[PDB]
Amino acid sequence: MQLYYLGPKGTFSYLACRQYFSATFQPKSNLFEVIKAVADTSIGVVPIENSIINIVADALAQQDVFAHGEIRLDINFALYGNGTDSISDIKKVYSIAPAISQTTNYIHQHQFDYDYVDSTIQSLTKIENGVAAIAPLGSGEAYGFTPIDTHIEDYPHNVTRFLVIKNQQQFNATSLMFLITPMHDKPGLLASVLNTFALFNINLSWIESRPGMYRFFVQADSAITTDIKKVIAILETLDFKVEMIGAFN
Amino acid sequence: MQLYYLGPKGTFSYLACRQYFSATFQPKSNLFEVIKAVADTSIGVVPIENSIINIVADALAQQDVFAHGEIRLDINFALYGNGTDSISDIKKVYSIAPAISQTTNYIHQHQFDYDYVDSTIQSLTKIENGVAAIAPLGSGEAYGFTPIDTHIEDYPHNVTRFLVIKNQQQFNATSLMFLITPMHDKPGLLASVLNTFALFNINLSWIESRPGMYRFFVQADSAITTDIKKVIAILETLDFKVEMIGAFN
Amino acid sequence: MQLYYLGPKGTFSYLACRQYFSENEATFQPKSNLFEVIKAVADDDTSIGVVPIENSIEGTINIVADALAQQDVFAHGEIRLDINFALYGNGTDSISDIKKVYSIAPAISQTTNYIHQHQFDYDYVDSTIQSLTKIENGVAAIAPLGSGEAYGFTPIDTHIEDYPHNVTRFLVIKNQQQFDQNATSLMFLITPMHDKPGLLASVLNTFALFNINLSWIESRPLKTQLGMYRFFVQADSAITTDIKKVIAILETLDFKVEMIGAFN
Amino acid sequence: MQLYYLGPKGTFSYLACRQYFSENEATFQPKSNLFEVIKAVADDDTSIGVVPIENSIEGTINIVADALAQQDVFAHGEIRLDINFALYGNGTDSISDIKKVYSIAPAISQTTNYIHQHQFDYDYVDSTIQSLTKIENGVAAIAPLGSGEAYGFTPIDTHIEDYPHNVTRFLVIKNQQQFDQNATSLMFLITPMHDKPGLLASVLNTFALFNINLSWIESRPLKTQLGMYRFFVQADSAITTDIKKVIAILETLDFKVEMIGAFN
Numbered sequence A, B: 001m002q003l004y005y006l007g008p009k010g011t012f013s014y015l016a017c018r019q020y021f022s023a024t025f026q027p028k029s030n031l032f033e034v035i036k037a038v039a040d041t042s043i044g045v046v047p048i049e050n051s052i053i054n055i056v057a058d059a060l061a062q063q064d065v066f067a068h069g070e071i072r073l074d075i076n077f078a079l080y081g082n083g084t085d086s087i088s089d090i091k092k093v094y095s096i097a098p099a100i101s102q103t104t105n106y107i108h109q110h111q112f113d114y115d116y117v118d119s120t121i122q123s124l125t126k127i128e129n130g131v132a133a134i135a136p137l138g139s140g141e142a143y144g145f146t147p148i149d150t151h152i153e154d155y156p157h158n159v160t161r162f163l164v165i166k167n168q169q170q171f172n173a174t175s176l177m178f179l180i181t182p183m184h185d186k187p188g189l190l191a192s193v194l195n196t197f198a199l200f201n202i203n204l205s206w207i208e209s210r211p212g213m214y215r216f217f218v219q220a221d222s223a224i225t226t227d228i229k230k231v232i233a234i235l236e237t238l239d240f241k242v243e244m245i246g247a248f249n
Numbered sequence C, D: 001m002q003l004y005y006l007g008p009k010g011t012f013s014y015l016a017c018r019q020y021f022s023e024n025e026a027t028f029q030p031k032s033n034l035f036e037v038i039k040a041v042a043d044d045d046t047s048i049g050v051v052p053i054e055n056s057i058e059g060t061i062n063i064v065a066d067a068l069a070q071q072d073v074f075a076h077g078e079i080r081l082d083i084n085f086a087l088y089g090n091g092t093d094s095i096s097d098i099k100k101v102y103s104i105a106p107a108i109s110q111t112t113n114y115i116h117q118h119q120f121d122y123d124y125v126d127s128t129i130q131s132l133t134k135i136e137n138g139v140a141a142i143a144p145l146g147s148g149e150a151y152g153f154t155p156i157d158t159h160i161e162d163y164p165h166n167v168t169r170f171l172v173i174k175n176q177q178q179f180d181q182n183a184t185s186l187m188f189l190i191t192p193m194h195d196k197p198g199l200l201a202s203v204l205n206t207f208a209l210f211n212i213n214l215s216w217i218e219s220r221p222l223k224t225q226l227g228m229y230r231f232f233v234q235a236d237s238a239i240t241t242d243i244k245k246v247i248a249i250l251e252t253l254d255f256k257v258e259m260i261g262a263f264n
């Protein structure tokens, strides 16, 4: 049971693999390579919402891969030092760009100097007297480093969402993921779609547009119900191609 | 007139700077750094739709930066060789991961071996006898390289969209960009919004959700009109915070 | 205090007045037609009137809806009347004896399956008391259930209506515009200023947004211009912030909105 | 061929029949009430009937709407009649001479500002010919414009209605259900199977989706159950693919849909 995910050890992907469903781990260098692998009858963990995905949504649409589960990662950044450098000894920090913005206020509270690095790995490289790396919690410790502080990010409940993927359309599910594709351009296509679910009061937890026409990624809090089959009928009558790409709990 | 954008010379950002509004160029290492700079009373070019942006949408929301123009880049990949290696001499190619997926069929038509590289710069490094780099057209030539072929991507009209940004809320505009933020959670908030514009038949060219609540990025094909002021009134009555973040032609 | 309604005695209006009011807290004042009823309420400051508003079986509610639109009169309550009928005869006859019935037109129309099942011959009369005067051996009157006993007659048969849940809704009306004020249903007049496609949907979509039920929706033509309409709507809500929201939205959409009623 | 309508001669129905038909392609058959009209059309296979459907000023359209719902009768066309009135007198009198008018109730209600401006005293009569019989020195009849000249009288004054664009819409009805077939407006009966909030909006929202205008929307109560309704809708469209789409959607939403009319 090969579990393909974005590596190396210590990424968000790996953290969510581990911290959630604690199973032979197979790290991949980026996501194209993890989707390919999954699409051998194996498993994959891979982000969809707000990561630090075109590719993912896209393979989901190709029917190369299907979503059987969800995992929501508590985004969290730590500060890693050289071993009892105390926080007040940190002169300078090193982190990738998206993480500097996640933690820009922390940098400021403390008036750290800072600059950028291609990797969290490279962040760890820079650690020395008066130098700390901002990286995800649970991640510096893969390579023997101990946080100076933790929950470092400016905003309190930032979350990334991860899908469990397979090459198996094998979906008692109580959340459903749909690709809804317009067969022609007209005004208000997204509106059509949202309104059809809202007829039936089917709450949509997540919705996404992707290509100047767009197709639609929607996720609904509800089981396979007769109401769901109705909105499907209506959408098809409205000219939407409808394929279910996820079903889970 | 410092023009801040994502570098180095030969990125999509730079290409759109150049090919569109052909002006003192100031390349930046990534986008956080270009938004900061813009937010000195200067200019910025920066992508919003489908790039190969959390950060961008986010600064637009902070009112740190405002959009005064649009540029749509014809995505396009070329094949760069060592100088009359003909296409049939290419054994292997090197490119970043998102570009391999853009061109996966081209790789296959020709049965190239392939692997990944951190950069287009690094792609160019690998060029030798029997080795070619897949990179954006107009980009290998910044560093003296000539395409083996061009329009290499699998799908024909992929496009990225770029905003012209400023630290100036100084908006005769005929496209309008709004941040619409819900003051509370209830079902169908996005629906509310789309339906209000559709009352007035105001076509929305682009719409985006971002944070488990969401705020909304919408762009409307219409001027500052009395109808637009109406939908604004309605949205405020519905409890949406409304700020205009873009206005252009 | 005056209670105007459509007479003569034994109409459905009259019955609604009996069901819903004491004779010893109102003086009953029958009028000849609905125009007169509304006119009397309009001019008598210590009056109410009871007037059909939904599912009349005789005569149009438009005249009532127009009085309300022009604010000649105001709605201060509603009452629902079951529309049921009986067969009234000579005290002797059984149903097997009846050869012929006489009835007002509205009553025939509601009891036609009845009339047919029984193969009665029939003819029309101008009023229920008229009906009653045709009674003799083998002749019956079809009348509002309980109207024959207002004149000293007895049914041969009752509950003879063809449908069981036919209900006419009446308004209790007054010439004063000041309403109960823990009101739990609201009536609005809503008038578009310009012609636009989908005006009614607009209105209904707005109330749905705040999940507020409409128990009644009526339209009437402007009459001052071809093609234009106004809307009558009754909402199950007290006057709340949600309600002020829909009015604001409707006004932004260029409808004028006015409360024409409020009660329980 | 029979043309049933509400009499006697000189009603608005009668006038609509004159405006819209030859006497020499129909035999005119007045009936006493709308129930009789609909009943005659229902039983006469070579018949039409002309019957009010929108903006009646006298008497309810519900009976017509119910006949249509039960498919006793079918709509094969519509005609619009201007509702206008004249003052009819003794050939001698001028308006300055008139002390008193007599009129049917519906006519008083539409000419009341008129009556008031001129300070006529008035009273009611049961029909326009009755009106006409009250005429003498200082006494006039208010009647449908062109109905006095059906009996040999002349107006003292015309176009005396208080509003200029009051229009009653009539249906041309038949007991056969087979329609014109380059039809450009469609009438549907649409009935929900279950009670749900926002049923009417559902229907209207569905037609809007395909940008199809509704020129008329009416509701009627089920009557077999409390609380339930059916919907009458007239759509400006021929029978197209868009139309088949809305019906499919409506049926998916658990309405039954049936064509009750189709014409131009």
Ligand code: NA
Pocket: C082, C083, C084, C161, C163, C164, C165, C166
């Ligand atoms: Na009953």
Ligand code: NA
Pocket: D082, D083, D084, D161, D163, D164, D165, D166
């Ligand atoms: Na007129």
